[PDB]
Symmetry: D2
Subunit: 120 residues, 4 copies
């Protein structure tokens, strides 16, 4: 499957994941600094039987930005695909929703993209 | 938390979820038809200690579209917030990524918005 | 024919007046429900001027940069969607608002949402 | 403004744009992907008086995918910012909506991200 392990995004945020045999993703997400106060639980799912035609392996995961140290009252989901080989990558787009009042709900959600690599 | 229960989106797709003490979301997602072939595992995260200022509760979850009957080689993440009160609602935006070759990756990801309530 | 020219409202009452040109152009203004001049901005976009005849909607999109003579938010929004005809005509959209940021803050430059418009003032 | 010119995205699509003094963007777009041939008209807007604090210049534009050669019954909008630097760049995210039936509207909209430089 090639997904289990440590991954690094374009700015060095660190995605630590186990791809279980049942299609589960479990792990932690943290900043490039690597300090414990920046580390959060993640969970998600992946395609455990992907195509063997050069297509990527679809996956997604969520972090709610609450840990024992802080709480941003927000959650990010990453949706994307793992691409194997000598240029291995996880290519994602993400949605970060903050808890808001209804009056501020129109501006609750940020969107962006993250590309993860196996080396920093 | 108010999140545990059976929810329906605007097209009747059915989200059966449990919100655990630790911030975990677990459950299943299926079509309005309610047939076993359309039912899939989900996992996610939510803010287990939301603000007390009238803001919503941030959350997200993932389904990989593989079960014992079908594999679409794709995964969806929903990112949103739970809004409590008279009529509880979960307002989300979602990203559905299909596994693609690199040449087709431009058309890998659909986006939309789902609103869930506890009534069909 | 196209059904798009005129005034559209979301449920919060933000309002746009648009002309759908025979050339595929969209031109008009976007404003708040209050309708004061400080809230009104130039809108420009494009639509499919020869849509399918199979019951499909009409694809369209437009941009507003949030600068006018009275304010500048240093940002722009694009709405991408489709027009759906009938007595309760609707424009169903999703949108992206990008704010000018430094590179360090670029990860948080872009909001996403959805807007549905109808011809009936709320 | 720095915006006026010929730009290319990461896939080699060609974005030929003029930034008018009135905040207008006009020009043509030639797509390296999809149901597309030759140039398509674009129009959009940009911030003609950007902040002077090091921030980029917000802008957006639309292409409806109809020209004299073909009609994909769809439209893309790009929302982003121009980043003046050593190597000027326009970083965008985009939404491509197809005209669909109501039953297919859930899968009407693709999302992605394009980065443009004046060097191909």
């Amino acid at each position: 499957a090639g997904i289990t392990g440590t991954w690094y995004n374009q700015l060095g945020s660190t995605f630590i994941v186990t791809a279980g045999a049942d299609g589960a993703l479990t792990g932690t997400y943290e900043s490039a600094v690597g300090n414990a106060e920046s580390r959060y639980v993640l969970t998600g799912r992946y395609d455990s039987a992907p195509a063997t035609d050069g297509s990527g392996t679809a996956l997604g995961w969520t972090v709610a930005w609450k840990n024992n140290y802080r709480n941003a009252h927000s959650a990010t989901t990453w949706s994307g695909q793992y691409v194997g080989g000598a240029e291995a990558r996880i290519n994602t787009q993400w949605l970060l929703t903050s808890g808001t009042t209804e009056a501020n709900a129109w501006k609750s959600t940020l969107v962006g993209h993250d590309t993860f690599t196996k080396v920093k």
